[PDB]
Amino acid sequence: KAPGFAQMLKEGAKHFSGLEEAVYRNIQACKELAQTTRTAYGPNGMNKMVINHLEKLFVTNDAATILRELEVQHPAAKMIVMASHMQEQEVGDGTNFVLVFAGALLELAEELLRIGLSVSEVIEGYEIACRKAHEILPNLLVPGGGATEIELAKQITSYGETCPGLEQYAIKKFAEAFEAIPRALAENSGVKANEVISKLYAVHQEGNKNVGLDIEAEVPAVKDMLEAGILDTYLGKYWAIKLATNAAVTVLRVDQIIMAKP
Amino acid sequence: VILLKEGTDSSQGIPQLVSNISACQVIAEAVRTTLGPRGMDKLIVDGRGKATISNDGATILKLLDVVHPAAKTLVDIAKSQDAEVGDGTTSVTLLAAEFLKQVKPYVEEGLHPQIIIRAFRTATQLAVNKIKEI
Amino acid sequence: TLNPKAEVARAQAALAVNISAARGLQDVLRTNLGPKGTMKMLVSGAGDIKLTKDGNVLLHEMQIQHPTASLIAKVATAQDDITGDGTTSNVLIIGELLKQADLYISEGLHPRIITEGFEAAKEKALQFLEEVDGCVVPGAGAVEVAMAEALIKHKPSVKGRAQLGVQAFADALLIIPKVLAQNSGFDLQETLVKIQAEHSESGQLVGVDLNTGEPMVAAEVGVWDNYCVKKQLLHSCTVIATNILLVDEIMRAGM
Amino acid sequence: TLNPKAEVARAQAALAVNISAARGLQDVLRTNLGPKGTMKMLVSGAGDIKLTKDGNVLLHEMQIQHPTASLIAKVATAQDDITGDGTTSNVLIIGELLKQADLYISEGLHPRIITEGFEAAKEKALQFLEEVKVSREMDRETLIDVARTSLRTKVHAELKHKSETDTGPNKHTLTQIKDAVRDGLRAVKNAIDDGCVVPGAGAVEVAMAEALIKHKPSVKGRAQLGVQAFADALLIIPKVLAQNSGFDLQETLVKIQAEHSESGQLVGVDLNTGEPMVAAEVGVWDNYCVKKQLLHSCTVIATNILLVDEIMRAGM
Amino acid sequence: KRESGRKVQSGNINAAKTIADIIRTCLGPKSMMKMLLDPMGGIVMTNDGNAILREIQVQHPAAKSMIEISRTQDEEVGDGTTSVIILAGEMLSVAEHFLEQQMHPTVVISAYRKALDDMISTLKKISIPVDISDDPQLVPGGGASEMAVAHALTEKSKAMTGVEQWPYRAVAQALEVIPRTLIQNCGASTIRLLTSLRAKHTQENCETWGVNGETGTLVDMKELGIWEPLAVKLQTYKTAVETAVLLLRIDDIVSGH
Amino acid sequence: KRESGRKVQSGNINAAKTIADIIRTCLGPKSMMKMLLDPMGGIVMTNDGNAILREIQVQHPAAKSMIEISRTQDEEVGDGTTSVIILAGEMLSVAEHFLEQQMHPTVVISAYRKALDDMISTL
Amino acid sequence: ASEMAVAHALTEKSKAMTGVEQWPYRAVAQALEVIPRTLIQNCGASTIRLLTSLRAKHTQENCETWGVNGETGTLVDMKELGIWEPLAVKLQTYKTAVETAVLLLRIDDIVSGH
Ligand SMILES: Nc1ncnc2c1ncn2[C@@H]1O[C@H](COP(=O)(O)OP(=O)(O)O)[C@@H](O)[C@H]1O
Numbered sequence A: 001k002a003p004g005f006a007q008m009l010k011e012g013a014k015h016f017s018g019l020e021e022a023v024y025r026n027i028q029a030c031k032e033l034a035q036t037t038r039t040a041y042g043p044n045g046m047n048k049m050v051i052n053h054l055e056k057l058f059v060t061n062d063a064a065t066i067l068r069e070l071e072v073q074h075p076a077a078k079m080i081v082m083a084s085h086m087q088e089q090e091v092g093d094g095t096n097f098v099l100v101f102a103g104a105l106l107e108l109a110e111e112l113l114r115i116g117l118s119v120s121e122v123i124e125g126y127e128i129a130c131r132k133a134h135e136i137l138p139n140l141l142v143p144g145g146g147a148t149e150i151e152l153a154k155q156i157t158s159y160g161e162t163c164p165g166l167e168q169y170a171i172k173k174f175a176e177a178f179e180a181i182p183r184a185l186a187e188n189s190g191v192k193a194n195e196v197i198s199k200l201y202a203v204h205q206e207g208n209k210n211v212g213l214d215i216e217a218e219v220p221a222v223k224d225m226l227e228a229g230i231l232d233t234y235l236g237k238y239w240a241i242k243l244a245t246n247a248a249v250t251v252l253r254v255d256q257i258i259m260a261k262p
Numbered sequence B: 001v002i003l004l005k006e007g008t009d010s011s012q013g014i015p016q017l018v019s020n021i022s023a024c025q026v027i028a029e030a031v032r033t034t035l036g037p038r039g040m041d042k043l044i045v046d047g048r049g050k051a052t053i054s055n056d057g058a059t060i061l062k063l064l065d066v067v068h069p070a071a072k073t074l075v076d077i078a079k080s081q082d083a084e085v086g087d088g089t090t091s092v093t094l095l096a097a098e099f100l101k102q103v104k105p106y107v108e109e110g111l112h113p114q115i116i117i118r119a120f121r122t123a124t125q126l127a128v129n130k131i132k133e134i
Numbered sequence C: 001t002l003n004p005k006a007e008v009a010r011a012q013a014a015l016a017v018n019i020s021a022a023r024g025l026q027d028v029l030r031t032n033l034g035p036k037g038t039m040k041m042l043v044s045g046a047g048d049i050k051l052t053k054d055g056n057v058l059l060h061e062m063q064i065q066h067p068t069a070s071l072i073a074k075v076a077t078a079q080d081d082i083t084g085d086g087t088t089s090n091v092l093i094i095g096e097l098l099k100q101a102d103l104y105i106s107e108g109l110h111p112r113i114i115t116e117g118f119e120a121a122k123e124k125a126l127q128f129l130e131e132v133d134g135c136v137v138p139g140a141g142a143v144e145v146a147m148a149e150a151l152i153k154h155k156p157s158v159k160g161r162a163q164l165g166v167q168a169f170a171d172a173l174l175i176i177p178k179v180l181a182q183n184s185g186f187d188l189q190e191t192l193v194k195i196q197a198e199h200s201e202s203g204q205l206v207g208v209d210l211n212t213g214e215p216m217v218a219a220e221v222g223v224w225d226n227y228c229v230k231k232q233l234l235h236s237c238t239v240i241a242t243n244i245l246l247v248d249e250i251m252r253a254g255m
Numbered sequence D: 001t002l003n004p005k006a007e008v009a010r011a012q013a014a015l016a017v018n019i020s021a022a023r024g025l026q027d028v029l030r031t032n033l034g035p036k037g038t039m040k041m042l043v044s045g046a047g048d049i050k051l052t053k054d055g056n057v058l059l060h061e062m063q064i065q066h067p068t069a070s071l072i073a074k075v076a077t078a079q080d081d082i083t084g085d086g087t088t089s090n091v092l093i094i095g096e097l098l099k100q101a102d103l104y105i106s107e108g109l110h111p112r113i114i115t116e117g118f119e120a121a122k123e124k125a126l127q128f129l130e131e132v133k134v135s136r137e138m139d140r141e142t143l144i145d146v147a148r149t150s151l152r153t154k155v156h157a158e159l160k161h162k163s164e165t166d167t168g169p170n171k172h173t174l175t176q177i178k179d180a181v182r183d184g185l186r187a188v189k190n191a192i193d194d195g196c197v198v199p200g201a202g203a204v205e206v207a208m209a210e211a212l213i214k215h216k217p218s219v220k221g222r223a224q225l226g227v228q229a230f231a232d233a234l235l236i237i238p239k240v241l242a243q244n245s246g247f248d249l250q251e252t253l254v255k256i257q258a259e260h261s262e263s264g265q266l267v268g269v270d271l272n273t274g275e276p277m278v279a280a281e282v283g284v285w286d287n288y289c290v291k292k293q294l295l296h297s298c299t300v301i302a303t304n305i306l307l308v309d310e311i312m313r314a315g316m
Numbered sequence E: 001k002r003e004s005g006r007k008v009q010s011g012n013i014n015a016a017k018t019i020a021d022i023i024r025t026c027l028g029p030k031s032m033m034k035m036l037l038d039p040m041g042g043i044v045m046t047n048d049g050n051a052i053l054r055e056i057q058v059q060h061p062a063a064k065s066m067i068e069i070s071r072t073q074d075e076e077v078g079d080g081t082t083s084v085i086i087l088a089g090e091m092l093s094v095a096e097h098f099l100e101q102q103m104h105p106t107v108v109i110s111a112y113r114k115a116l117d118d119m120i121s122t123l124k125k126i127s128i129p130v131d132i133s134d135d136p137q138l139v140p141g142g143g144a145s146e147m148a149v150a151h152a153l154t155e156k157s158k159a160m161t162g163v164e165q166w167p168y169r170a171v172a173q174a175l176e177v178i179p180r181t182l183i184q185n186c187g188a189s190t191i192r193l194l195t196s197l198r199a200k201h202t203q204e205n206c207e208t209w210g211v212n213g214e215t216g217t218l219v220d221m222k223e224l225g226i227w228e229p230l231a232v233k234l235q236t237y238k239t240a241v242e243t244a245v246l247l248l249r250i251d252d253i254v255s256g257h
Numbered sequence F: 001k002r003e004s005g006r007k008v009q010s011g012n013i014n015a016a017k018t019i020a021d022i023i024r025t026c027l028g029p030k031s032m033m034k035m036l037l038d039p040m041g042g043i044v045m046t047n048d049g050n051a052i053l054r055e056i057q058v059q060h061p062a063a064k065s066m067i068e069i070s071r072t073q074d075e076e077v078g079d080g081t082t083s084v085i086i087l088a089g090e091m092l093s094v095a096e097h098f099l100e101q102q103m104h105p106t107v108v109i110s111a112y113r114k115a116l117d118d119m120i121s122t123l
Numbered sequence G: 001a002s003e004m005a006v007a008h009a010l011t012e013k014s015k016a017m018t019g020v021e022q023w024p025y026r027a028v029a030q031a032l033e034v035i036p037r038t039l040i041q042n043c044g045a046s047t048i049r050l051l052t053s054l055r056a057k058h059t060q061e062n063c064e065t066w067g068v069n070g071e072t073g074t075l076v077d078m079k080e081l082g083i084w085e086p087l088a089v090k091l092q093t094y095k096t097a098v099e100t101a102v103l104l105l106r107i108d109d110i111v112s113g114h
């Protein structure tokens, strides 16, 4: 009986209407991929009781082993997983950087699309911010513990505030995507994440770079990553920010999943 | 049509930990009455109908082979204690489920699991130091 | 009045089914028009993935549920082999031609009268290309905006009711500059009214600026299309939009 | 997003509910436009039958089930109080104005842009009416053409204890003739008070529509979409006259539109022939206040109904 | 099991009329297309009356006889297959006499056979010779032959004393379907042109004043070379009448091996 | 019967936000009209923010507070009443920091009261 | 104009607001933008395009002008268009919105009883 399903003419696939926000659904598949690995991020990462295909029990916190055992069937999630596989090429770390960062770019993109900003304009902002991040990263081995993620966010947020036009909305959200990584370290350590971001921005406002999250259960304060000896690799952050943005942009460019047959 | 799980059953957060805490208490109840020399016996029947009566905690866990994921952790830990020592599997099994029971209401109140681990790692070393001193 | 194992739509519902299929296929491919347009995924079922905006690959390799839409899919295979481009815009004009035809068919107009207007506008549309294969033509919907104004300033020579078919052909060509404004994230009506209002006392081209949304002279920026593409487009859309309108009944041959 | 014991239509579907009601009320009254139009019956339930073509009686006395359509009925009451004619044509233009607006609103156009075009098309259409009106002297030969044009639309082209032509045998026939005389007297009143008259048979609507199409934007670029919708809305009057007379809707409108010359030329729909017809020559004349109030009444209601964003229950 | 009585003749009419209603619009240069849905989703938009019914599988025996006769018509003659089925269906669509009036089929068959002999006699009068050096006899197409023949029967029926006059005139009006479909496909008013068309054959010569299949208006066949052969029309009317006479004689459809 | 916990604040937000979404388009000289279905099948096409909410039935007490505060505005000032409900609904519509971030209302209220002193000075 | 003018003051003043209160403090500023968001929605003009440029004018040019024209939809200075409203109406409109939002936020249990 009419009116049936709207915009459904290709093999009866689940085509979300204009009200159902087909783009919003492919993003939700990627956000769920981050929550499966957002908790395993950092030294206090939570282990996963993985059950192998041979009915074998393994308790681990490695991202590559989680995804290799988790049969990811959604194609929108496979793209981010393919970036993790491409992350393994040219570097052997930063896998969860691709999952956590890309999940924040897509999660924050929904706040822009909901306002009414076009998906093609959101992509131009992330591509501009990725190019801007590669110029700021040499100025920052780089500090870890979420230190670069706040400074790189602070430097990119200022570029978006002075840049007029519509690209500033996606450029600012590109900076807030970096904040998800300190928020992951704080949540996995049992600390109010908003208090970590508030302190990390204050010390960076005073110019105290190289300051990261002090990993401690009973101390939500911060410390210098240089004095403690915590350091990350430059190419690990370079190729992670690059592949994560391409995976997020590649998902945003897609608006409809369609079946086929040879 | 297009879903992420497609048979992949998964749950996360506080409900998963609370589910494992309750599953660990089941292994405790199976060896709770056998603690001590005068502990109650346990009757176990294999597939062939052959009976097995024994009040040893280690022998009981070998015959159960519980399929729950969290329960296998205690069984493999208790089995290792039997191979290395041959005694104390019931004390290890009961204390583990009891550490989990006491922190159960705090986990429900929003206390992070990692803060609980720092307490066990801290309280354990203080206890081991008190044993050698006394 | 019917036999067992047989079904037929004797009324005009056969057109409403075919017209609805073209509108559905229009809404699918209109999002991948131009560089600003979005991409479509092609899942082969076995796990392979293929992204492409080329309409022929989205019609030749992909599978379509509607039987009527599969006819238009075969047309793109013909459009690709002759010119090599214009398969996506060919489907948009067919959908908008059939859309405007349904507006007049609901008013009691016969379909055959509308097809005669397309044949008259098509012959006038081809002559406009010669005025504006070593020859090339502008892009950015500049020819469509120009041919639309040309067809409006042209009366029939066979009958008066063909004036309606010419009006449907004029408003159908404007879907290309309309869709280019949608994919670029600009208002559909503001962009078209600007390029259509731009006029002068000289031969002047005007198109859609995908980055700014304002009018744009395609010659002053380096945006050019082929002559055979636009030539085959008018001849292809008119033939298929015609034949789809001449379908009076749909009978199941033992389906 | 609503309280219990109530309902709310948040999205633009609330506007489609009002467009559907006007489209339905259009299809009801279009069959009784002009002399060749059909008649409608008014069954009071008690057992009284009543036949009439007067749109004011088919909206005031006839209770309407749809809530939205009852609003337009109240306007037909107001339209009848000023001029006493044009209530039927008022509803048909409202139905087509909202119909044409939905074509552009579905493309993502805001209603407020279309309404601003109606205000521009109204002023242009109102100025053109001043040029078409004939300010000749009212003589018995002229008022007969006005009375015939007004009375033909309410009788059988032929007009107790006496036949109907003794000016009736039945009760409802006397009420039908009483309404036609009051509509005929008010028509001669308007032509005498307002000395200007305008041609009929849709000749003014066809001429004003051609003027609006030949009018570039002057208030806003996108406003011309409403001007085009206003132009196509006016053409419903000659379209309906071709339907009720039994001729093709498209052939009649295209012929009268093709009539062009280097002089004042206003053609209308010949109900017996279907071909174009100079309404001023054959003796078809409408009032100046009727066409004047139509543009003021059609635009205001078609505007206000377009500005309706939500439909809420006030404790219903 | 078995069907007898007026149920049989009323069923054969609905069957032959249904097969004719399908291909009503496939007549003339403005032949409307037909979309045949194959079981595998395949579609063909052909507009040939032969290929349409060839692929449509039917169950009614009367509809099969109407199809098989057109197939036999296609081999002996390469034209007129669509007109045989439309006329045979229109001749049978006049059920006012069979059921409401309770006329026996033998009475109507006497009228249909009488009209066929007179329909043939009317064609040969409006014929025209041929200079084949540049049966040599043509006839005016475009509905002119149908409306010309119908005028003769309507005048001949005035002297037809008996109850057979009513179905005799109905066959004449049934021939108007040919210009009816040609006018419908053009999009013009069917009643307005068909009314004026019948008046032309009354006053003006019957050999001309047909229908324009491309324009939609009336035109003479002397100015437009739509002249058809004579043998095609004779076998067309003869086959349509003999087919209508056949199905009317069917009053008991029974099984048996 | 009663409400407790986070369901209350998120519920009061949806009630106040819903009342503001009604009269979002009733602002300015190009205000949009509203259709009020009477119980007897009648319609009132008013475009006044005070008249619309006066005739609408509300079940949540939070909506009654928003409406009753608007009536107090009309007695003092016969203008700008529609801006009060829209701003009050938009200030409450930011439920990200309210519940999803698990901030206490005292933290939010201290910020809203700090901004109010700054909004007054800037004006 | 007064909404966007005030919102720029809070956004610039929130830069020196060390703590978690900066996030809701900035959210109040973005809430004031809804007033021109509705004026632009009613006229039919693009909301994001004009509201974006509207905020840029307050940054560079003086904040006392460069508001929105509800009739035309484009931007216009209030010195050129007499849309000047009183102060007591806006202050009471701003307090009543915050005081009302502070009220409903202070509700945590809808209780029944007399
Ligand atoms: N001891 C530590 N203190 C603070 N931060 C750390 C520490 N160890 C690792 N990290 C942070 O955790 C993040 C992930 O590190 P790692 O586990 O090596 O990569 P991945 O999570 O991709 O496997 C790094 O960006 C780093 O900043």
Ligand SMILES: Nc1ncnc2c1ncn2[C@@H]1O[C@H](COP(=O)(O)OP(=O)(O)O)[C@@H](O)[C@H]1O
Residues within 6 Å of the ligand: C032, C033, C034, C035, C053, C054, C055, C085, C086, C087, C088, C089, C090, C139, C140, C141, C176, C180, C208, C210, C223, C225
């Ligand atoms: N850079 C551009 N600017 C404006 N219009 C463009 C641009 N590129 C392509 N187009 C328009 O998009 C239409 C489709 O182009 P194309 O994608 O090559 O064909 P198809 O869509 O059939 O695959 C063309 O008619 C052209 O006018």
Ligand SMILES: Nc1ncnc2c1ncn2[C@@H]1O[C@H](COP(=O)(O)OP(=O)(O)O)[C@@H](O)[C@H]1O
Residues within 6 Å of the ligand: D033, D034, D035, D054, D055, D085, D086, D087, D088, D089, D149, D150, D152, D153, D199, D200, D201, D202, D237, D268, D269, D271, D284, D286
């Ligand atoms: N004799 C006629 N010939 C052509 N048109 C006519 C004739 N009489 C009336 N009309 C048309 O019918 C329309 C309605 O006329 P009338 O019945 O007086 O008003 P209403 O339909 O509102 O009661 C007028 O606009 C007029 O143009």
Ligand SMILES: Nc1ncnc2c1ncn2[C@@H]1O[C@H](COP(=O)(O)OP(=O)(O)O)[C@@H](O)[C@H]1O
Residues within 6 Å of the ligand: E027, E028, E029, E078, E079, E080, E081, E082, E083, E141, E142, E143, E178, E211, E212, E213, E214, E226
């Ligand atoms: N050029 C034409 N103009 C008008 N009518 C035509 C024309 N050509 C054919 N017809 C009509 O179409 C009908 C069918 O012709 P034809 O196709 O030869 O036979 P069939 O349809 O049985 O194959 C004829 O009765 C004829 O009157």
Ligand SMILES: Nc1ncnc2c1ncn2[C@@H]1O[C@H](COP(=O)(O)OP(=O)(O)O)[C@@H](O)[C@H]1O
Residues within 6 Å of the ligand: F026, F027, F028, F029, F049, F078, F079, F080, F081, F082, F083, G039, G068, G069, G070, G071, G083, G085
């Ligand atoms: N001509 C105008 N141009 C732009 N904004 C206007 C105009 N007139 C009123 N407004 C805005 O509409 C808002 C509401 O005004 P008003 O209707 O007087 O109060 P209320 O809506 O409470 O009755 C005011 O805040 C004012 O800024």
